[PDB]
Amino acid sequence: FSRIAYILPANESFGPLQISLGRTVKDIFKFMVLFIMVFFAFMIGMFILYSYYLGAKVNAAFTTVEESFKTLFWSIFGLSEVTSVVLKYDHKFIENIGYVLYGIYNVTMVVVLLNMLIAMINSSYQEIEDDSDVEWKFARSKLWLSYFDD
């Protein structure tokens, strides 16, 4: 169902859309690489912190690597809950450490990476102008040029 992109650019009002889509994907590739770098960095520390609490947290949280991936992925969208840091053993020190770590990850990663992405995309846009028609024409040319020979 996603393979429909072949027969999309032949139309008028849809080419430049697809072209800028591909451009922004190729751009955000590198931001994705840096974000997964920092993701790995935070997730290893978060799996080491609660490695010796099997059945001590409120929810089934920060017990194995798969679960750490789950929570740190689904918190990027606000779908994960803060109650995934509360404990049952008192150990107030480790509890504050975890709250601090989770918060600082949240702020740093999410906010700074998003603002970097958008400011740099407006940067990469403002330098190149008026040739989107040209790029759409080149793409459409490849498209209905591939139908001639055989």
Partner: peptide
């Protein structure tokens, strides 16, 4: 990371950070 998941590794990490310092 190897020390993370399941005595020598502990001392090696300590020696490495002492070298950094």
């Amino acid at each position: 990371v190897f020390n993370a998941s399941d005595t020598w590794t502990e001392m090696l990490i300590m020696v490495w950070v002492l070298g950094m310092m």
